[PDB]
């Protein structure tokens, strides 16, 4: 799948709260979550309080990945709405984060590489004396 | 006699303590009417104190320097009933309890769900098992010789 873009999407109706972005947003990074709502309805923000999401495409800014994922999973469970979020740096780079293959991770799809697979039982690991005086670790082998 | 102790029927501090306690009781006895119920209660207390002191003296205990009886767990034949005679009795009773419990557990190991029998005891089987502990040493010794006491 080709990653999409978020040029000029509007934002939900909110009155403001003290759980928003901080200096880290200006300094390090933040996250942007976009979805599509069929009707104007009231939902609950991760930061605190209640907001209203408009009909059409909706865009929101958050400080951590956990907040984006929690809001997205609430949308999926309760409203049956697909969602996607990116990460934004101060330099303007935009990185696509949620489903990278266009499919949620809970479902298998060919074309996915295996990472961090140990082909042995958890009780076959070597003792720490074997790996002493070297940088590697027993579970790393 | 033993470890520089004095027999309890010969020491003087025992009598002094008895006199002190009796005087303390009689001081409160005087306040009430002689025929009133508190007078009867205090007279009963005085009689109990005197009987206790006489029994302690007659039982052959050994008071110390300060005036209190001292127990001897050494093993001398003159103090069989001080520690050794009661202790054996305890073991007997104690063994009883343990034996009974063990038996009951085995009696419920056969069924598929023993937890229901553990949280809700049954009275018939427990009553059958209870009286088998009266001869616990013999059964325990026979099981130890046979080899069924220890799991394998």
């Amino acid at each position: 799948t080709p990653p999409q873009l978020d040029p000029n999407t509007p934002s939900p109706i909110f009155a403001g709260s003290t759980g928003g972005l901080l200096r880290k947003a200006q300094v390090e990074e933040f996250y942007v979550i976009t979805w599509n709502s069929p009707k104007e309805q009231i939902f609950e923000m991760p930061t605190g309080g209640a907001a209203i999401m408009r009909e059409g495409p909706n865009l929101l800014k958050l400080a951590r990945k956990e907040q984006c994922l929690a809001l997205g999973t609430r949308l999926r469970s309760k409203y049956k709405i697909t969602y996607q979020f990116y990460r934004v740096f101060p330099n303007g780079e935009v990185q696509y984060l949620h489903p990278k293959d266009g499919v949620y991770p809970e479902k298998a799809n060919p074309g996915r590489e295996g990472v961090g697979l140990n082909m042995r039982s958890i009780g076959k690991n070597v003792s720490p004396i074997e790996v002493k005086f070297t940088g590697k670790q027993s579970y790393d082998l | 006699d033993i470890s520089g102790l004095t027999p309890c029927k010969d020491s003087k501090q025992f009598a002094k303590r008895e006199k002190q306690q009796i005087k303390k009781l009689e001081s409160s006895l005087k306040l009430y009417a002689p025929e009133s119920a508190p007078a009867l209660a205090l007279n009963a207390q005085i009689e109990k104190t005197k009987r206790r002191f006489d029994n302690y003296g007659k039982y052959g205990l050994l008071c110390g320097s300060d005036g209190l009886p001292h127990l001897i767990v050494n093993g001398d034949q003159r103090h069989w009933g001080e520690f050794i005679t009661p202790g054996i009795l305890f073991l007997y009773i104690a063994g009883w309890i343990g034996w009974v419990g063990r038996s009951y557990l085995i009696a419920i190991s056969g069924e598929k769900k023993p937890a229901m029998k553990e949280i809700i005891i049954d009275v018939p089987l427990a009553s059958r098992i209870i009286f088998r502990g009266f001869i616990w040493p013999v059964a325990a010794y026979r099981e130890f010789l046979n080899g069924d006491l220890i799991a394998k």
Binding site: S11, F14, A15, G16, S17, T18, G20, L21, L22, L60 | -
Partner: protein, 144 residues
């Protein structure tokens, strides 16, 4: 912008409060830091002189004023040392300033020169001079 971690309230953004806060020496931008440091030090020393001369261990003797003034001078010296240490540890020499470059209107503005090694050094020197001057002026006024 609602999603920024702040709120707009009568106290936070009021004409009187904004005007008062935008005139304090620590918030001017086009002024070189030395004068602002001098003003801040003068105010702080003149304020600080009082409690030491009033509640010190020698408040009941004839040595109250001198001991209190000396204690205030010591506090000013320690504060100057702390400021110098913070300036050394925080800002680098050749790097540009890290002040915001645009205001609420969005109009671009020159970044403040206080958030730099030389600017902070000038501010600390001015603060030290102003604090010493304020302490001695308060001592002169109180006991003459």
């Amino acid at each position: 912008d609602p999603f920024i971690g702040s709120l707009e309230t009568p106290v936070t953004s009021s004409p009187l409060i904004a005007w008062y806060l935008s005139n304090l020496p620590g918030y001017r931008t086009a002024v070189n830091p030395l004068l602002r440091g001098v003003e801040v030090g003068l105010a702080h020393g003149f304020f600080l002189v009082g409690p030491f001369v009033k509640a010190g261990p020698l408040r009941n003797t004839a040595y109250a004023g001198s001991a209190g003034s000396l204690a205030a001078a010591g506090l000013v010296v320690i504060l100057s040392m702390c400021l110098t240490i913070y300036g050394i540890s925080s800002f680098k020499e050749g790097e540009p300033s890290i002040a915001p470059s645009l205001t609420l209107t969005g109009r671009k503005k020159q970044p403040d020169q206080l958030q730099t090694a030389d600017g902070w050094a000038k501010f600390t020197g001015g603060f030290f001079f102003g604090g010493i001057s304020g302490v001695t002026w308060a001592y002169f006024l109180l006991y003459v």
